[PDB]
């Protein structure tokens, strides 16, 4: 349930012991998770 | 000189309701108060027969089931105008002048032919509204076949394994038996699937001896009706089994009148018991639960004879025709011509993992080594 | 809703109403006004 | 042709069409039980498809109706009131043209001397303490059938020609000669004119003063008539452009026009009213098909 | 001309009794047509499914008013009204009818706590409120005030000022306008209406300025003086920083006037309110009233 | 990567069977009425009909028989979302002007606050394509991983939500377990050890839910005339109503043939009046779509055109080619 | 009475009488309100010889009394004076697709390049005014008022650069244009009152409204909103910012001011808005004849 | 042969989708059934 | 051009104007939209 | 107009003459061969 | 409105008997021939 938008990394943070859902944009293409963009895929885009 | 030749006019053919073979599906009975009827309903009483259980098995109890079927209702209308000048020339002559005589006779023929055209239009609207209701009712063939295959035990309504396999069977029946006349050519196979339709469809309630009866008392059983583009191919592939025979068919509508009993109960209790006088006089006697004829459904009407294109499907004589002769020149479409909407999906840019990558069909194609050829970026496919 | 009318009043028999065994129909709610009872229910006899 | 015969045929056709609208054929089984009075009433059996004018009964305290219980045919005004006991109250056009500003002082005092009592004084005080005029008092229709009991019964016509019953002595709208004016290049252009009522306000340094005008013009189109009335009222319009900002009273326009209905050009005649000896000049419109349109304001 | 309506679902006895309570009412109808189903009867096929309030106000102007006459066994007889003739209207709205009042149709104050006169399988029946014209103007102005001030923040009296807007009174019948704190049940949101008003009040002064700064040599004599007064009273310090310091295009002026005139003839809906009915008499206990039909 | 979805409309002749005397019709004597106007006198003849359906089981069936034509292009004109949700914008004027510039929308400044009924209520196109050769086309859009397995997903009839959403495997009248089927990933999907293949379509609040579900489409304004062929998969208020028992599901389905969807005017619109006779949508009923014969390049497409093998799917190294599931080209060539 | 008989003064031809048989059910306005008329008062040609000014033709066409053609017989020509709220069938002339449900007005003829194939007979023509939807009638009246406001700005070739961009408009896939506006002073009065009302909207505009622009720019954000931000950025020729933003229960004054602003807007709309003459109910499939239930 | 299949349906006018699919059908009928006696030999086909 | 795609253009019955110019897809009696079909490239052609 | 059986060189044209496959269009690296849409040679051989 | 014979189209003329080469196509008897016997020896070709 963490992945909701492929541009936006989502998480839970604690401020004053409230669970605080948190959206934060993945800016660069590599900051997408490696099961969602494997390293051979980055090498293939690099060879492009 | 400019010579103008003879004026040729059209003759519109006349559509009796009981000439078209939709009237074997129909059973039409005049009743002059459905403008005030709220809900017509028929009430059916089914008691189920059970099997005797073996030793030390809990016997299922005697099961009594009632189902009530309601009435939909649907109006039709026809409007036609008369112009003010035609209405002036209709009724009187101002003087005995020749042009007044000619336009008087023309306006009289205009009014008479317009009334004839409106009566024909009400008959064809009855055809179209009943065909509308049949297509609103009728579920498709793959659903009907899958529901005939899947039945239930007493214990619980359609277990999850049953309905999941039912869904997968719906997938399979849809993807095989979709485009029916076009894929195969086997008269054996196509006759088999029409046999599957006629065994899948359940039978009606009323068994009249004379409603659509052939010679020597064999009743015709249903109608198969399509458009003419289907039925030309169907005759060309099933000409062995198609005949034409004379069937004793009704010609007039049934007719029902209230009594003072029914009108009084309609005033007092907002309701009508049909078959009320038989329902009254069979009360104190022994024959309570038996009653023979339903006056609202079985009523004496005039009979005639006519020809029908029939088929023989395992000792089943079925009328078989197209309604194009009543949708020859009509603003509404033949409603058997219907549209599908199939949804398609396809990818682009899916990176197959190089780490577990392979290729079959190596001998067929061979790429030129470029990373635009080694990564999919676009997707190619054919149009219509 | 009137079911003792069915339970008491005259009825016309009819041949081959059904094919797919109304156990399935009633179990999967095909109908609009249905009513089932297993043992002989006495509430047809309480005529008021 | 014969001519005389066809004329009689057309007259018989019109009389029979009047009977077809008036009576109704009965398809009851019509048995011989009833008495002869019910017999002849079941043969005739009237219905009200004959008058085709729309009236309204109205109750008003009779202190307010000083010339209008005698002179049939007047504009009437509905004044809603915060008193629960009488929620609406009815008002003569002359009763409101008293404190209209268009009327000269001689005619104003003369009419007031008709309209001097305690009830009318209190109602004029209420009308003056009201902020604007046009949506606390409003146009209501044309007078017929004054009864003058204790609380006088007034019929009043919303639509159609003005008559009580019998379709005899069809009364006419009576407009005070001073308050009306016809803005057009050719007065009485070709044929039947439309009669309007124009409410125009004015501000003499302290308060608002209303003015009640009646216009007669050949134009049907309301945009055309407000376009001719702006050209007529452009100066005082300018004075209100200065007033309506510094004021805080809840109004947003200079005036409003509303159609009374049709008239006829040859059915315009002068005259004078008299109540208690006060001769008062009027322009008596004779036959009026009353047709109230909506109020259309202009700023 | 009459209209038959046959319902789509079945009706309860309480529903048929509701219709017999509502046997005279106005119903708007999209298609001027003889046979109409309950799938298109009423106004709920338009409101709640499509842009609301201003297109709703245009649509309530442009639909066909049609009154209930008689309820059959299960069908509805709706007679559509002819101009210049009498009809009879029952009183559904809260405000009391009086004689000689003009009547109009306002959209319903669509709180979703209403009793929902019919609710027949995801379809419901919504009628417009027949109301006097003065109250209709007042309701329109209060709604535009609510829709304007609901966008402002940091008023610490915002609750009491919305409450003083929502409470209106007319002939001793109070009602609260249900567009409270933007509950969004049906706020109607009126966002083009307030946007259009403020486009008018913002594009007005500079358009009248660019027109009036030209051709004063001709003796108009009234317009030039009036605009100077009207503009420099309210906007007393007129055009100091100027934005662009008088570099305008004739095409830009063209686009300014064309836009500011589009806004007016498209807010034409909230411009006027037509008198659908002029009630001549009102029956006792204010149940129903016989009126005449206009527009 | 992206699953592109597209619907196509087919002209189909389609026959009916019905048992004899299956349903009775009761009628009134046709009533005459006359409206006498000043230019015409119009006579209206009205007639009331009622239908009682006497058979208990389905006494009338209907099978798809033969294709006439395909009114769809099967083109590629994708859904212009800048005309589908034409109210939205990026913040800066330079950014928004450059995005409209590069994606090539016409009329980049809407003048909505001036004239909003033009474009909130639905941008009227005002101009069809001047040339048109194959009928209607419209292609919707789902954004996705470059990771999602082809052979699990793309080569078979399957829901493009990623997680399958067919209510013929859910407890009827159990909306809690229904929403757990549409959303839960503590549980698994069937058919794989993978409860998801599109974690931006299947997941709640993902770019399936925030973009195509009408529960959020009615919040974020849009053209109602714009036809989106993925609302039929992602509207969940119109699948929790399908969470009923099976005969109610198919009665609701065969009653859903009012066919508001036209097949006129150069592109798929969705008008909603129900004038057309009939449509039948088995993809709507089965809640999945179909795979069609696409490929990754012309190299694989040429050998497909040689052997005709549009049924068997085959893959190169990173170039894939999907097999078609209904050989409708062969169907058209057979008639 | 209601019926009017038109009798042509000049003789005609069989092609002419065939055109009049084609031309049936067309609204023709007459100025006379008599029972007999000649060809001198049929149609609109007895006014379109006087300066051919479109505003002038529109004004007198408002003053006209409209009738409907009925039953061309001999050289006589029946005209029904249509009653209020009744239903009549109208054959259409305006080049439009005529979607039902809308209101119609009656507009002067927009001069196309091809001459009328209707009736030209002995220095007399049959000038039939068009019937158009009310929205495009208001659009034309906007364009005329706009050319008045801009042709006050006296220029050379800028009038042309405005007019050639402006005049050709497209409504329901139909291009129309109206030439040769000599820009008389009659439009200047109809424009002076728009100028008055814009001055008063400015002076009586409340404090909520100009604030509402900036407040909604800070709260919401949209491209459509930006278009309005682009207008307010493109012209900043007022710049007079107010002092207070407290709104400390001035609410009756606010109601009074908003009522005034709406009423001035209604006045400008009453300028630009033309009277609905017809209400369409039923349209033929040809879009050639259609029924209405309303006659001025 | 193409006109009898693509007869105008009872609507307002002949539609663009109708005539475009009619044009594609013209292409297909022309490229299939052009040289008639010479390609096939099925007496059933030629009789058809 | 030496760039024009074979498989989109040359392998099919196709107009050698490049842009296809068949009047069976154009609005009849509409010369303006006709010349837009023969000349315009703000619009796209079909088939690509 | 119609496409006819052309090719880029004799290499492609000889294999076309071998298999008779004048309908299917096939490509080499930069050499191409266009498939014929009416097999008029086979038409003339059939009569 | 009724009219029986059209003299410009129907007129009494003498009849005879002759042979034709016929085909049967679904109860349709069709004459079937070539005009080469009248284009045997001319200055024109057979226009088919």
Residue numbers in the entry:
A (entry chain s): 530 to 577
B (entry chain s): 50 to 433
C (entry chain E): 2 to 49
D (entry chain S): 1 to 299
E (entry chain a): 2 to 296
F (entry chain s): 1010 to 1344
G (entry chain W): 1 to 296
H (entry chain t): 194 to 241
Quote from the publication.
The T = 16 icosahedral HHV-6B capsid structure contains 12 pentons, 150 hexons, and 320 triangular triplexes. Each of the 60 asymmetric units of the HHV-6B capsid contains 16 copies of the major capsid protein (MCP); 16 copies of the smallest capsid protein (SCP), each atop an MCP; five and one-third triplexes (Ta, Tb, Tc, Td, Te, and one-third of Tf); and 12 copies of pU11. As a result, we derived the atomic model of both the HHV-6B capsid and its capsid-associated tegument complex of pU11 tetramer. Beyond the capsid, the helix-rich tegument protein pU11 forms tetramers, bridging the space between the upper domain of the hexon MCP and the triplexes Tb, Td, and Te.
Only the N-terminal one-third of pU11, referred to as pU11nt below, is resolved in the cryoEM density map, indicating the rest of the protein is flexible. A pU11nt tetramer binds atop triplex Tb, Td, or Te, but not Ta, Tc, and Tf. Atop the triplex, four pU11nt subunits cluster into a tetramer in a “VΛ”-shaped, dimer-of-dimers configuration and their subunits can be classified into four types based on their relative locations in the dimer-of-dimers: pU11nt-a-1, pU11nt-a-2, pU11nt-b-1, and pU11nt-b-2. Through this structure, the N-anchor anchors Tri1 and the entire triplex from inside the capsid and beneath the MCP floor region, simultaneously sealing the hole at the local threefold axis where three neighboring MCP P-subdomains encounter one another. Our SCP model encompasses residues 23–83 of the 89 residue-long SCP and consists of three α-helices and two connecting loops, folded into a triangular spiral with the N-terminal helix (H1) pointing outwards. Our model shows that SCP’s helix H3 contributes the largest number of interacting residues between SCP and MCP, inserting itself into a groove in the upper domain of MCP. CATC exists as a group-of-four subunits in HHV-6B, but as a group-of-two subunits in MCMV and a group-of-three subunits in HCMV; it is arranged in a “VΛ” formation in HHV-6B, “Λ” in MCMV, and “Δ” in HCMV. Conceivably, the rigidity of the helix-rich pU11nt tetramer may have made it impossible to extend in order to span a longer distance, or to shrink in order to prevent clashes, thus explaining the absence of pU11 above triplex Ta in HHV-6B.
